Subunit: 344 residues, 5 copies
């Protein structure tokens, strides 16, 4: 028999009246395209830009009854990617593209095969830089949901309908891990049907849940800010007459916490609302700012001028309380802080 | 009947004399193109570069009387995006492009449909990086107006006229929020008709008002600069004989305010005029620079050599005034500062 | 009559012998192309990279006597930008391109029209990233001259000659302002004719003068460096017996000036020669380095061991002179500094 | 005889029935493509992005029995790179591309030659930016394995099989050195055969082992952090009555180690787990944080109020122990640290 | 006579049997291509990336005896750049490309002319980003040699041979200066013939010597590090009883030298070996680290407890020696340092 590249020329030629500009089942029911993706790579989730780069295999399946054959004996005909400009393909796009491209190295990374009953599989490799909004109300303790949605650009709902297939609509590669996040196994698959002044267009989307990793932000921000608070607590065990010792400790710790807070938001969007790392670096700034205000009460009362042995005993009393009080208030703040951002 | 891709070949072929290089109503009245956009994405408003990236759907509508049909029974004919190089389309462009591109993934994201009376809708997806000048005279308290304008490149006013449509000339997507800005709902739609030595060309434009968000700049700059001013005020409650205590406080606060002011303009254009954050960081620098000049008056008068008990009582007098004076002057500055940048 | 797109096919076809590979007036006098540009955008003048991005309209006018018509009644024929590959156009390029591109969004932004006597106007929109050398001998006080030059790549001087037109050879858009510079209205238009081993080629160029803005560099560098010098002057009003007060002031100011000088050259090319901001940050470093060397003369003479009451009166004498001397030397330096970089 | 470009037209023409859309040995055994690469350049191994750029020559060899010739006398026919779109080539791609491109300057950098028995060599130049996961559990002491894998996109295992050749499957250029790494000479060549819902596809891969260089991280991080620990040890040789001397040393060293640790992770991914440089900068932070806690035990016991001469002799005892103890504990930590990250 | 674009069609047509896929002198001696470049721009020499961007005119000359003409009277025929796909051109490429592109603005910047004896000149404009390894053993005092090499991709040595022409093989533009380097006038022109498993291929290369500029690195690094060493020398002129004065000077200078050394390698590759700026910043760190170890010997001996007047006179002796010793050791280090990196 004649080879499949020549048999498939007679199935697309001027004979038999095939036209690549006309959808299947024309002037009839709409075209039911069923889709699933395969995430090869994932990551580079920039939070200033609020986008993320992904690398997928987009598989599409529809039924073209004009491509049904019975003369050729075998069961599938792979169409060459040079000849893909000659059959009908759906005009899928991404409603949050922000730039995308094809992979064309050593061959156009495209694939198409046609069954005997006209079922057409069409798999392509796409790199996307998808946009997603970042809710950062509790920034190291959040679950970021970044989505991707697949619309039709030119065919309306009465012509072309997208669906996810019921057999694994999103697969993920095996060794796909992320440096800052983890990807939860449940993926929300729902509809996102759009309405414009043109018509109404089909849309399907898939949610991805990205829980962060606590372990990085503990090392850089939570633990060193917790040591500077303890570094202000050793002022109370220093003699009151050593005036540049207790002041010189209180000067430096209250201005390194300003440095630790200025570097806390170096790689973030400039959001207006206050986030959970900002309510840590402000309360921890409040303890080291009050550790120098304690000595301003010591140095004012102990300099009052028996009137001498009274106020020195009173300024001794404010130091015996503050050695017990300030680690007790910082301890009950950590109880109210970490429980609040674990219950949420 | 014959399918619409073959009917529309007879409407564009050598028969009937259609030519894609000739405007409609040729040697007659000009072509009235009516336009509206649909902002999908918005943002990445860089202020050093003074540009902003947007992602729109550009819809254009005109009337080509050579495309009026009556034989084919239905009411609209979608032209395939491979065959868009064969009818007349307006040569719209953006007068402040700074780079732009099309979206061509899985299909050229283009759309065209023709009514029975020759009305041609033409919608395309464009990514723009539009230039806009930044007026930063009151930088955290400003309303930035960045525009976009749509000109004709080759047809003059007596051939082609752009208009906004009266039914929603700029729509914005539903969940379109910005991290640093808010987009006001009123959009100024006016004309921008250009005059060159070639001819005069049509132009329409749309203003977008971007009020900022106060909440970010309070956390990073206004509040920590306000604490260092209070950190210089606790010098007055420290004994005068503790010379490295009052000097060592005044040294450090006056040089961290130089650090807080150098980081205040890290992500800005290098504008010449003074802005509202620069008149904050200079007056707040003036208080901490005068808090060390106060002790230079203390340490000079208290070292004069009853002549002993006189000048110590005089140097005590300058400290009792300055504990009341300096928070009173900083309080009446905040009244004159925030009212001035709220009335404007 | 037949429409202009069909009339102009007969003027470019195989009939009448038109050939797009042959210059006008062939085997005769050279082709006189007259040019002018129109600067839409200007800026992003990077000084590390030593380049600047511009966005122009390049208009070219020449006379092709093979395009003279008299049958068609009207006076200009706009050629469609799809058909621009069929007439002769000059091979202009930029001798300092460093990358450039066309604008092709919604139409190739090109324009061509032909008069009855064969005059051909040809306007295109180009984005350029032009290279220019930066003379930075007096860096905030300089006038940077960055040019652009327009050569012929394949035709020599005996075939093709470029000229500027005498009627406004460089226009600038109305609202074109720069954040760091101002553009002077006089533009030097001169010839730049090149000689190679191939032949000699035509060239025209245009100089642009970019005077800077003083106001930015005063706020970030000149004023805060001037306050740290005054911050070292308050050491002389502090008692000599307060040894960590006068030393602790002199330590910190001499090492923040090293920080202010290291940040003074953060966004600059690594030029070898010394510039006017470097001779400011070195003399201002010399005052704060001598303010601690003054106390090293105080603390050595006042510790000599009537021999006691003599050297204390001598160390008092070196402080009464230096309270008058050091602001007097810094005042006469500012006279010699700002006059030198105003006369130049 | 006729020249080889005309002889090879008769071997690819409509005569003899050659078709570039049909694999060799069709309806028979699969195609055995044998491959080897040649690494020209290597490097720019970004660790935040977790990728690396490489520049290779990809050679492929297969046997097409339809290209066997015997009339033409010579032994190889170089096909011109303009005519490479007319014979069958394998659809190899890289499963971890992350962007790639061809080299097309002065000629498409492609090469193909055909032997008399139909052996087809096909060498091309490709630039790849390959993705690889970074295991950073022991960050300056690790061996990073970054791979590259070569799959088939459209042909399954029963049609096309990739193999490495047994004669030097990966060559490396002679002067190919790396700034941060060394490339080990043994390269693991194994199979990576993929299974999808489409079919099963061939895959071969090559592992590259990149041992780092110790010498950079010693200079920037290990040695200066080791000097600040010694800088805290000289507190014990300073008198106890010099209260701003021993405190003022302990303040500054414990907050420069926070600076040295914040800069230790400036160019890294934000991994959660703790790495070997993080357990250095935390133990070295523990010594300088305990060097100030030692004086808090000195300044509390020496201020107790023979009761005077007792506790001063006891506070002398805690200083004689700590001059021997703290360099002894830091010495036995370096034994347990460097042996642990040398045995692994 | 017929015009040259039509005469040259008969010299490339199906008549006369010209074929653009066959080299000149086929089945004969190899093709002797002679080459020379013309450097327009040079620079952006990134040292982290270890590459440099250049902009050249690549001229190639060979002899095609099939292009010899005698009927047409004139002496050169310029081929239009649209018709360059129809004659034979060498497949030159760059063995260290790392990305390159053509210049195609307003015309493809290409040029070809044919003499009567068949000599073909072919000049094109190319932008290259060429890779070169950086030897940084003596980093501010080095001569960097970065090369560029021009190979053949498809023709072996028995088919095509590259040569430099003997008349100025590398010209440089007149005003071509560099911000960080100077380009020496002698350029080493040698052969680089490659051997692969395919065949042996021709190669020619050109070395460029880039001596740096000393003047930048003196201002930022050598001079401010030399002032901090002098800033530690003024400790010896301060009284021994002023304990926070001599310690507080020694604390700050030894930790700003760590800052000056951390910023010394901010824009460098992470090389393992020690370089000449690293042996400066380590010896200068050794002087300021020993200036605080000197007072640790003072404060231990002067606190020993005639036994009182003995050790104070001994601690006075260690200060009289160190005022002479430490500037004498730093002076003889500068003799051994600058002579060593001037003799090399
Ligand atoms: C595409 O999918 C939908 C859902 O299966 C089909 O639409 C329905 O099909 C059934 C039976 O054919 C009808 O009873 C319904 O009236 C149809 N409409 C709705 C809204 O449910 C449709 O037939 C499918 N089209 C093709 C070509 O397969
Ligand atoms: C395009 O729009 C303008 C405005 O509607 C039209 O120009 C005017 O049309 C009316 C009636 O046709 C005339 O009375 C005016 O003299 C026209 N000119 C001006 C300046 O107002 C124009 O007719 C429209 N052209 C088309 C093809 O619709
Ligand atoms: C192009 O411009 C130049 C200058 O106008 C012309 O060259 C001169 O033309 C005049 C009169 O035609 C002659 O007297 C001169 O001898 C010409 N040469 C020089 C060097 O001055 C030239 O004619 C113009 N060519 C065209 C086609 O317009
Ligand atoms: C491609 O490679 C494989 C391995 O050499 C070949 O497959 C085997 O070939 C031998 C002999 O031809 C048979 O005994 C085996 O049954 C084959 N299959 C397996 C799984 O081992 C194959 O013949 C080669 N094909 C070509 C065209 O060379
Ligand atoms: C290309 O260049 C080389 C060197 O000039 C030529 O090769 C030699 O040419 C001379 C005389 O023609 C012979 O004596 C030698 O035997 C040749 N080979 C060698 C290795 O020296 C060659 O002829 C030139 N080819 C062309 C077409 O000009």
């Amino acid at each position: 028999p004649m080879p499949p590249s020549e048999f498939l020329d007679k199935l697309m030629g001027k004979v038999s009246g095939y036209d690549a500009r006309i959808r299947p089942n024309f002037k009839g029911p709409p075209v039911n395209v069923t889709c699933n993706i395969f995430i090869n790579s994932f990551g580079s989730i920039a939070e200033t830009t609020m986008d993320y780069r992904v690398n997928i295999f987009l598989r599409q399946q529809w039924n073209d009854p004009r491509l049904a054959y019975s003369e050729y004996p075998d069961d599938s005909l792979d169409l060459d990617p040079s000849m893909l400009d000659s059959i009908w393909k759906p005009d899928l796009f991404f409603a949050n593209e922000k730039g995308a491209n094809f992979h064309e190295v050593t061959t156009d990374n495209k694939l198409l095969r046609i069954s005997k009953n006209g079922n057409v599989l069409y798999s392509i490799r796409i790199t996307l830089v998808l946009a997603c909004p970042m809710d950062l109300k509790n920034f190291p303790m959040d679950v970021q949901t970044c989505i991707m949605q697949l619309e039709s650009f030119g065919y309306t709902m009465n012509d072309l309908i997208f669906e996810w297939d019921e057999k694994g609509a999103v697969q993920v590669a095996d060794g796909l891990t992320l440096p800052q996040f983890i990807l939860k196994e449940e993926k929300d698959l729902r509809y996102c049907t759009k309405h414009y002044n043109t018509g109404k267009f089909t849309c399907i989307e898939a949610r991805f849940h990205l829980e962060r990793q606590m372990g990085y932000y503990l090392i850089q921000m939570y633990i060193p800010s917790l040591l500077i608070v303890i570094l202000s607590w050793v002022s109370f065990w220093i003699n009151m007459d050593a005036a540049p010792a207790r002041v010189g400790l209180g000067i430096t710790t209250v201005l390194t916490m300003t440095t630790q807070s200025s570097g806390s938001r170096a790689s973030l969007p400039k959001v207006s609302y206050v986030k959970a790392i900002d309510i840590w670096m402000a309360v921890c700034l409040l303890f080291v700012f009050s550790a120098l205000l304690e000595y301003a009460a010591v140095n004012f009362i102990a300099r009052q001028h028996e009137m001498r042995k009274l106020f020195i005993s009173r300024a001794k009393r404010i130091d015996t309380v503050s050695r017990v009080a300030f680690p007790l208030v910082f301890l009950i703040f950590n109880i109210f802080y970490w429980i609040t951002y674990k219950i949420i």
